[PDB]
């Protein structure tokens, strides 16, 4: 039993965790891979996403070579605080969580040649800038960049453990996305330049496409039904002024409620989205159908409708409005054309 205690004591005896391996002699090379155990929700309001990972790092440290009856020491994560580890931080990382239940969710493994494996379980919240002009038919590439905070590229360089595509792996059942699809990930690396030197940065982009199904049910269908409802008043007789006024006013006010309730999901951006343009055109169609009736009412001479027992000699009775007859065709046709142009504009692109 004491054989392994003497090995660990010898490893730390004279060890200086203030100094990186190979300091003053070479560049510390850190191998890195990420296992995404879950891809958490994307927050449109905060323009950020959550991701739970096993952040694996590996590097060589000749000070920790040993000879014993084992080739790998699978040690308690208490040991990792006694040795030098990379100071990796996420460049676009917001408040992230290191899991501590029931113990620090870290593992340290030392092989006999000095190679270290150091993985931790993190909940990472990272900024994802979004261009919501195509919402809800938008797509995003949410980045995840990390690298050393303190060591320039002449001291610490990061590389992927395997081929870059295979170095970030997402669990099959880990998708915690509700209104997005994970199309895939792009893995790259580069150099970031600051006022304090040049730093290696490792980049992963997750490609997310919003799923439009929720917004078809809650926004597009009520908008389409409201526009269809507003064109119903074209078929009523021109003498039903209270009836055709309620049609126009109710549908205009309904589109007002829909428009205000539509942006409650989004951050309060200052540009118009694809949903705003659809609602605006739906507002124009609904508003014009009420304006159409006002023009019809302006040319209505008699306040009584046809009594049902008299032939109109084309007392006297008002005729069916030509504006009403033309609106029965023009309004459905123009709204049908708008839908064709709107959906082909955004679904194709």
């Amino acid at each position: 039993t004491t054989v392994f205690t003497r090995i660990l004591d010898r490893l730390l005896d004279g060890y200086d965790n203030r100094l990186r391996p190979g300091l003053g002699e070479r560049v510390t090379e850190v191998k890195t891979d990420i296992f995404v155990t879950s891809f958490g929700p994307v927050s449109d309001h905060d323009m950020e996403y959550t991701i739970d990972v096993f952040f694996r790092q590996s590097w060589k440290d000749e000070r920790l070579k040993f000879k014993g009856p084992m080739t790998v020491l699978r040690l308690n994560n208490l040991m990792a605080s006694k040795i030098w580890t990379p100071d990796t931080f996420f460049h676009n990382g917001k408040k992230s969580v290191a899991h501590n239940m029931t113990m620090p969710n870290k593992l340290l493994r030392i092989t006999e040649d000095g190679t270290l494996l150091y993985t931790m379980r993190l909940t990472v919240r990272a900024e994802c800038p979004m261009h919501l002009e195509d919402f809800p038919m938008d797509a995003h590439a949410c980045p995840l960049k990390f690298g050393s905070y303190a060591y320039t590229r002449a001291e610490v360089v990061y590389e992927w453990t395997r081929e870059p595509a295979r170095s970030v792996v997402v669990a099959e059942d880990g998708s915690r996305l509700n209104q997005y699809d994970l199309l895939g990930q792009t893995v790259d690396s580069g150099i970031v330049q600051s006022s304090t030197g040049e730093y290696v940065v490792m980049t992963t982009h997750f490609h997310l496409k919003r799923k439009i199904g929720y917004f078809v049910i809650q926004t597009y269908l009520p908008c389409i039904m409201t526009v269809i409802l507003s064109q119903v008043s074209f078929w009523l007789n021109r003498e039903s002024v209270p009836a055709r006024t309620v049609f126009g006013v109710t549908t205009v006010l309904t589109m007002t409620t829909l428009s205000i309730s539509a942006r409650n999901s989004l951050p309060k951006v200052a540009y118009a989205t694809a949903m705003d343009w659809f609602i605006a055109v739906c507002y124009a169609f609904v508003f014009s159908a009420l304006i159409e009736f006002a023009t019809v009412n302006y040319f209505t001479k008699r306040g009584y409708a046809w009594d049902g027992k008299s032939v109109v000699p084309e007392k006297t009775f008002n005729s069916v409005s030509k504006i009403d007859r033309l609106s029965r065709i023009a309004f459905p046709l123009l709204f049908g054309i708008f839908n064709l142009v709107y959906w082909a504009t955004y679904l194709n692109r």
Binding site: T1, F4, T5, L8, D33, F35, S38, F54, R56, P69, M70, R74, L75, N76, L78, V97, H99, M101, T102, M103, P104, N105, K106, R109, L117, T119, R121, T123, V169, S175, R176, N178, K211, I212, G213, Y214, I217, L221, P222, M225, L229, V232, W235, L236, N237, S240, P242, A243, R244, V246, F247, T250, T257, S261, A305, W306, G308, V312, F317, V320
Partner: protein, 340 residues
């Protein structure tokens, strides 16, 4: 006698290496687990998680801690847990968890003469479970707790439920406002990652949603508005202001019923069972209003120029008084039989 206990405990921790597991370099250490579930609450469909409070006990043997001459089980101050090796147990689907710390850290250490350690923790964990809401609110959910060792593979540690199916207690006393726990299941398997194979214990609960809340909130208001829209069929064709106002408002009221329901649910890209009903009830109120516009158009549009007859508005109204109640009951018959 108390001096003898102090000396014995000091002897155990002298030369003890907390960095090394029991039987380091030898056979894996077997860890037995028990859970006493204090409560389950905050089962959130919005956040796709549930909160679980439990007494979590681990049961392993450390031969370095065997002591003789004391016919007692030493319960020690929980701060001694920081001087002993404990398993690096973690929960994979854990989103946010903490060990309670009032008045002190809710932690138990109880040594036994042969070296057995009982390690108990009072834990509140918010674990993730993705819910299939396609049949919501007539849905059953399955939410799990995945217990695993982080740094030790199956070569170093083995998990098992101590007591078999009696390892987890207190499930039958759990009261959720919106769910009833149909059953709970204990699973022990191995999970392989790039760093090796790890023992895993899985505790899963099958949750059935109570529908009594949603009858009062969504279904009954929707049914009554749909029935309300049929009142138009008993009003004369020439009362355009009355029938349009009745038809328009019920269509508007259906949206008001839907928006409140929408605000309390996550952004779900598919149609739920509750969505099918609301969209079904919206069609009925929309068609009932479209029925009058057709009736108004026949009398006033096609009148002067000269399945129901489609030329007598009274026939269409009387046809509507039967078909609309009959079809809506037929829709309810098919809907409730498919989701129950």
């Amino acid at each position: 006698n108390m001096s003898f206990v102090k000396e014995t405990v000091d002897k155990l921790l002298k030369g003890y290496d907390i960095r090394l597991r029991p039987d380091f370099g030898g056979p894996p250490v077997c860890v037995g687990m028990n859970i006493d579930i204090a409560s389950i609450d905050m089962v959130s469909e919005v956040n796709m998680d549930y909160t679980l409070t439990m007494y979590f006990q681990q049961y392993w043997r450390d031969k370095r801690l065997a002591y003789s001459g004391i016919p007692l089980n030493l319960t020690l101050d929980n701060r001694v847990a920081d001087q002993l090796w404990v398993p690096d147990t973690y929960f994979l689907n854990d989103k946010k968890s903490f060990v309670h710390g009032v008045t002190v850290k809710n932690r138990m250490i109880r040594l036994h003469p042969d070296g057995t350690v009982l390690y108990g923790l009072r834990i509140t964990t918010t674990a993730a479970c993705m819910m299939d809401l396609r049949r919501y609110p007539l849905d059953e959910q399955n939410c799990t707790l995945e217990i695993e060792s982080y740094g030790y593979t199956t070569d170093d540690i083995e998990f098992y439920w101590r007591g078999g199916d009696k390892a987890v207690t207190g499930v039958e006393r759990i009261e959720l406002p919106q769910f009833s726990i149909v059953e709970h299941r204990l699973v022990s398997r191995n999970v392989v990652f790039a760093t090796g194979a790890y023992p895993r214990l899985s505790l899963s609960f099958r949750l059935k949603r109570n529908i009594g809340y949603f009858i009062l909130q969504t279904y009954m208001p929707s049914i009554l508005i749909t029935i309300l829209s049929w009142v138009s069929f008993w009003i004369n064709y020439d009362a355009s202001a009355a029938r349009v106002a009745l038809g328009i408002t019920t269509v508007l009221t259906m949206t008001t019923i839907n928006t409140h329901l929408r605000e309390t649910l996550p952004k779900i890209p598919y149609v739920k069972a509750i969505d099918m009903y609301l969209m079904g009830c919206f069609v009925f109120v929309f068609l009932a209003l479209l029925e009058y516009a057709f009736v108004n158009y026949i009398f006033f549009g096609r009148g002067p120029q000269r399945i129901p007859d489609l030329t007598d508005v009274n026939a269409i109204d009387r046809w509507s008084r039967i078909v609309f109640p009959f079809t809506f009951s037929l829709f309810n018959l098919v809907y409730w039989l498919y989701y129950v």
